[PDB]
Amino acid sequence: SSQIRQNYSTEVEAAVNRLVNLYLRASYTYLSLGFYFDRDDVALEGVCHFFRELAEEKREGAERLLKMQNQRGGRALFQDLQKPSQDEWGTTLDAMKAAIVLEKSLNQALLDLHALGSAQADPHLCDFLESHFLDEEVKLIKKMGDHLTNIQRLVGSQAGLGEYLFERLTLKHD
Amino acid sequence: SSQIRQNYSTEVEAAVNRLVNLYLRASYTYLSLGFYFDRDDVALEGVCHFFRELAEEKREGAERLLKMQNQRGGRALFQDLQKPSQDEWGTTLDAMKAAIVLEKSLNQALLDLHALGSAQADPHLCDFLESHFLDEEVKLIKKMGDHLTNIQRLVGSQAGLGEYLFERLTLKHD
Amino acid sequence: SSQIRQNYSTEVEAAVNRLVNLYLRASYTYLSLGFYFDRDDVALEGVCHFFRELAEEKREGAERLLKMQNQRGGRALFQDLQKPSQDEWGTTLDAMKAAIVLEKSLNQALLDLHALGSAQADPHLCDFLESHFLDEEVKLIKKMGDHLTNIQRLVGSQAGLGEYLFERLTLKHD
Amino acid sequence: SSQIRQNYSTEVEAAVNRLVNLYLRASYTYLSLGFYFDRDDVALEGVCHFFRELAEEKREGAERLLKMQNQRGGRALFQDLQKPSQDEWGTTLDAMKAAIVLEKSLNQALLDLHALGSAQADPHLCDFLESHFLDEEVKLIKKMGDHLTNIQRLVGSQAGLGEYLFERLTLKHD
Numbered sequence: 001s002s003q004i005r006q007n008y009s010t011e012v013e014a015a016v017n018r019l020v021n022l023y024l025r026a027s028y029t030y031l032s033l034g035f036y037f038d039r040d041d042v043a044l045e046g047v048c049h050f051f052r053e054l055a056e057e058k059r060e061g062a063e064r065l066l067k068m069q070n071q072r073g074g075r076a077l078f079q080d081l082q083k084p085s086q087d088e089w090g091t092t093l094d095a096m097k098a099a100i101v102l103e104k105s106l107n108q109a110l111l112d113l114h115a116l117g118s119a120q121a122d123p124h125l126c127d128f129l130e131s132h133f134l135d136e137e138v139k140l141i142k143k144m145g146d147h148l149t150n151i152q153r154l155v156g157s158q159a160g161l162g163e164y165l166f167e168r169l170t171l172k173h174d
Numbered sequence: 175s176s177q178i179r180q181n182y183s184t185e186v187e188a189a190v191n192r193l194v195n196l197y198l199r200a201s202y203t204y205l206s207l208g209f210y211f212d213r214d215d216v217a218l219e220g221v222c223h224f225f226r227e228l229a230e231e232k233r234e235g236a237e238r239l240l241k242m243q244n245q246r247g248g249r250a251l252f253q254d255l256q257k258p259s260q261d262e263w264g265t266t267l268d269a270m271k272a273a274i275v276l277e278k279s280l281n282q283a284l285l286d287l288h289a290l291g292s293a294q295a296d297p298h299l300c301d302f303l304e305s306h307f308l309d310e311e312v313k314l315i316k317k318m319g320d321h322l323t324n325i326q327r328l329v330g331s332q333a334g335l336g337e338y339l340f341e342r343l344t345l346k347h348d
Numbered sequence: 349s350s351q352i353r354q355n356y357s358t359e360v361e362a363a364v365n366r367l368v369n370l371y372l373r374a375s376y377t378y379l380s381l382g383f384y385f386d387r388d389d390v391a392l393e394g395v396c397h398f399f400r401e402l403a404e405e406k407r408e409g410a411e412r413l414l415k416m417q418n419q420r421g422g423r424a425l426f427q428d429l430q431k432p433s434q435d436e437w438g439t440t441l442d443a444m445k446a447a448i449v450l451e452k453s454l455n456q457a458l459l460d461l462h463a464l465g466s467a468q469a470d471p472h473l474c475d476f477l478e479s480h481f482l483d484e485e486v487k488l489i490k491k492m493g494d495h496l497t498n499i500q501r502l503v504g505s506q507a508g509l510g511e512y513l514f515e516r517l518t519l520k521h522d
Numbered sequence: 523s524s525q526i527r528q529n530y531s532t533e534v535e536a537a538v539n540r541l542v543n544l545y546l547r548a549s550y551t552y553l554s555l556g557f558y559f560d561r562d563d564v565a566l567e568g569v570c571h572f573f574r575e576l577a578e579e580k581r582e583g584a585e586r587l588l589k590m591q592n593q594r595g596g597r598a599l600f601q602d603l604q605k606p607s608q609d610e611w612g613t614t615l616d617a618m619k620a621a622i623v624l625e626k627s628l629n630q631a632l633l634d635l636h637a638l639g640s641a642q643a644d645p646h647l648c649d650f651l652e653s654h655f656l657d658e659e660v661k662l663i664k665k666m667g668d669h670l671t672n673i674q675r676l677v678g679s680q681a682g683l684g685e686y687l688f689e690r691l692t693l694k695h696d
Contacts, residue, residue, distance in 0.1 A: 104354060111355055114471045130475035138472055142419045145214035145352035153334030162335065169342045174219075178388050178667035180626060181633055202372075205411075206426050212418050214352050233407075240379075244386045245664045252380050255429035297636045298660055301652040388667035393696075508675030509684065516691045 005073025009120045013074035015113045016065055016125075021079050022109055023062035026102055030055035032084040033095055044163065046171025047092050051099070054140075058106075061133065068128055092163050093151045100144040107137045179247025183294045187248035189287045190239055190299075195253050196283055197236035200276055204229035206258040207269055218337065220345025221266050225273070228314075232280075235307065242302055266337050267325045274318040281311045353421025357468045361422035363461045364413055369427050370457055371410035374450055378403035380432040381443055392511065394519025395440050399447070402488075406454075409481065416476055440511050441499045448492045455485045527595025531642045535596040537635050538587055543601050544631055545584035548624055551606040552577035555621065558611045566685065568693025569614050573621070576662075583655065590650055614685050615673050622666040629659045 034051035037044045069076050089095045110133050117125035150170060154162030208225035211218045243250050263269045284307050291299035324344060328336030382399035385392045417424050437443045458481050465473035498518060502510025556573035559566045591598050611617045632655050639647035672692060676684030 100351065107354060111471065115469060126471065130471055134472045134475060138419050141352045141354070142214055145350065145421075146217040146219075148351065149215050149217045150338060154338055157332040157335040165335075165338070165342075169339075173342075174346075176387075176389050176667065177622065177670065178663050180629060180663070198376075202426065202429065205414075206424075209414050209418060209424055212415070213423070214350055214418065214421065237379075240383050241386070244383060244388065245660050247388060247664075247667075249387070250380075250383055251435060252376070252431045254431045255376065257426045257428045261425060295637060297633065297648070297652055298656050301656060388664055389671050391668040391671045393668075506679040509679040509687070512672060512676055512687070513691075516687075516695075520696075 002073045004071075007122060007124075008072040008074055009122070012113070012116055012120055012122055012125055013069070013072075015116055016069050016074060017077050019109055019113055020062045020065050020069070020076065021081065022106060023058045023065065025081050026106055027055045027058035027062065028081055029084040029102060030058060030099075032087075033089050033099065036089045037092075037095070044092060044167045044171075046167040047095065050171055051095070054099070064132055072124070091155075091159075092166060093148070093155055096144060096148050096151060100141060100148065103137065103141050103144060107141065110134060110137060176247045178245075181296060181298075182246040182248055183296070186287070186290055186294055186296055186299055187243070187246075189290055190243050190248060191251050193283055193287055194236045194239050194243070194250065195255065196280060197232045197239065199255050200280055201229045201232035201236065202255055203258040203276060204232060204273075206261075207263050207273065210263045211266075211269070218266060218341045218345075220341040221269065224345055225269070228273070238306055246298070265329075265333075266340060267322070267329055270318060270322050270325060274315060274322065277311065277315050277318060281315065284308060284311060350421040355470060355472075356420040356422055357470065359464055360461070360468055360470055360473055361417070361420075363464055364417050364422060365425050366427075367457055367461055368410050368413050368417075368424065369429070370454060371406045371413065373429055374454055375403050375406035375410065376429055377432040377450060378406060378447075380435075381437050381447065384437045385440075385443070392440060392515045392519075394515040395443065398519055399443070402447070412480060420472070439503070440514060441496070441503055444492060444496050444499060448489060448496065451485065451489050451492060455489065458482060458485060524595040529644060529646075530594040530596055531644065534635070534638055534642055534644055534647055535591070535594075537638055538591050538596060539599050541631055541635055542584050542587050542591070542598065543603070544628060545580050545587065547603050548628055549577050549580035549584065550603055551624060552580060552621075554606040554609075555611050555617055559614075559617070566614060566689045566693075568689040569617065572693055573617070576621070586654055594646075613677070613681075614688060615670070615677055618666060618670050618673060622663060622670065625659065625663050625666065629663065632656055632659060 030051045034048045034055060036042060037048035037051065066076055086098070089098060110129055114126055114129045114134070117129065147166075147170065151162070151166050154166050156162070204225045208222045208229060210216060211222035211225065240250055260272070263272060284303055288300055288303045288308070291303065321340075321344065325336070325340050328340050330336070378399045382396045382403060384390060385396035385399065414424055434446070437446065458477055462474055462477050462482070465471075465477065495514075495518070499510070499514050502514050504510070552573045556570050556577060558564060559570040559573065588598055590596075608620070611620065632651055636648055636651050636656070639651065669688075669692070673684070673688050676688050678684070
């Protein structure tokens with residue numbers, strides 16, 4: 001193993017490596033969601049921008065885990081990154097419902113790793129997770145929850161106008 | 175009684191103490207109205223913000239009365255604060271109708287205390303009330319009157335879109 | 349329930365709601381303590397000040413819990429707010445002793461909610477509490493412990509003068 | 523009478539003239555109180571400043587009334603100014619006691635003039651009095667009430683030390 005490793009289990013090392021793949025795959029998904037709203041036949045700039053920023057955020061989440069792996073003396077392993085589940089993502093409502101499901105599963109994975117951390121008695125991992133990932137995740141899912149109920153009230157009324165105005169007044173103005 | 179008290183009646187002292195409870199209870203109500211519009215399933219940020227600022231304003235109104243009580247040589251008494259009448263507040267229209275009724279009754283209470291003040295021949299109380307509470311109250315109820323007729327024109331048309339746009343263009347932009 | 353709620357239990361939702369009531373009621377207690385020391389026959393401005401700033405702090409502690417409730421997917425419920433235990437609070441010593449007892453029970457409430465959070469396996473709650481309430485509470489109860497021993501040495505020597513000097517050199521100068 | 527005079531009664535005109543004398547005499551009393559605390563055998567600088575600033579305030583109050591008399595079309599009449607009731611004023615406690623009694627009588631005079639103003643239906647006089655004198659008077663009598671209970675707790679412990687620390691920490695530092 002390596003000279004610096006201390007109270008870092010193979011069970012956690014392997015789970016951190018699996019979580020890096022999940023973050024990296026969420027990133028790839030948001031890259032796909034963002035460039036779909038840039039198509040000339042979808043053309044919702046604010047929505048493209050929303051998903052592109054989250055792509056970057058998840059890539060950074062994966063790098064932060066990758067660096068931690070190395071601080072603890074673990075060794076990183078990279079697996080294939082499955083392409084995003086869909087190639088066309090629908091409307092803003094369909095894309096937001098897809099994104100919150102995605103975030104929810106990333107959050108479950110953090111929660112599972114944290115439970116491992118405490119089972120393994122690793123206070124540093126538990127802290128690392130609580131400090132950088134657990135709250136960010138709770139805030140993001142609430143933002144997305146908020147966006148869903150606002151898209152749902154607009155789109156119920158007049159779907160095309162609703163999508164344009166949400167993108168216009170919430171995503172290009174908040 | 176206390177060395178500084180002069181032309182301050184027990185009838186007014188008791189009414190000021192009752193008005194502190196009313197302000198404090200209005201504050202608690204606006205705290206409840208504001209955090210309802212923050213729920214992920216209501217998600218109207220501007221409306222949450224409107225009621226949260228009024229919560230603060232009413233708490234300050236109660237403190238201003240509390241300080242006056244002490245300047246006049248009266249003694250403050252605090253009673254229980256009843257929880258807000260409702261736990262879920264409806265839509266922006268239902269919340270604004272509830273708020274203007276609330277303001278109207280606070281205003282009636284000021285008006286009643288002012289009438290006491292003049293019956294008791296207390297020029298300072300009458301001035302204190304006219305200077306800090308009576309005009310603020312008249313302006314606030316007119317603002318709320320204005321908001322009601324604007325929410326009512328939007329919501330008549332397309333209710334969901336109407337609520338989003340009011341929150342968007344009047345409360346996040348005025 | 350709500351689309352965003354995840355790993356948030358009823359035990360804890362219910363417990364945050366009651367802790368909101370405790371904070372709000374501590375807030376109301378300090379309002380009373382602060383305005384008591386403003387009475388012309390007590391006249392200790394630094395003490396009035398001390399307790400008024402704690403009233404603001406506990407009201408904000410309650411709003412911070414209320415905002416988290418909504419981020420997690422929980423639903424806020426407000427109960428009546430019991431009036432402060434006393435109407436007249438005695439001397440600075442009697443007031444500090446009551447205040448440290450109040451903070452101690454607030455702290456026990458946080459400590460019990462923290463224990464719930466971990467029994468329920470809620471890492472985010474435990475983190476939120478550790479980050480915003482647990483340390484602030486330890487530091488405040490120490491500041492108050494310090495203040496009691498200083499008031500006790502002063503007041504032991506000469507009562508009136510000891511209260512005046514503590515208010516003058518510790519509360520109007522620290 | 524004068525081309526500008528309108529709804530100004532001869533009763534109010536005369537009462538303003540008597541209030542000018544009261545203010546001017548209160549001013550003369552504070553001039554005396556202030557230079558008494560400047561005597562080398564009293565030597566309480568903060569107490570001297572306190573009463574000298576009030577002397578100046580009362581002379582300005584008298585000038586405010588005189589300018590009003592002229593705006594209303596009234597005619598000012600000046601009577602003899604009786605010398606202060608005492609030539610030696612005792613201790614800070616005795617001097618504060620005397621001063622609060624002086625402000626109380628000035629305040630009763632304002633109140634009685636206000637009552638006249640309303641009996642005569644003089645809205646401008648009532649406003650003038652409310653705006654410039656009635657509140658200033660309620661805050662000053664509270665400050666003096668605060669000062670008396672602070673001097674009484676000090677002086678009750680060790681009279682010479684109590685007077686020195688009051689002058690030192692409240693009047694040279696508040």
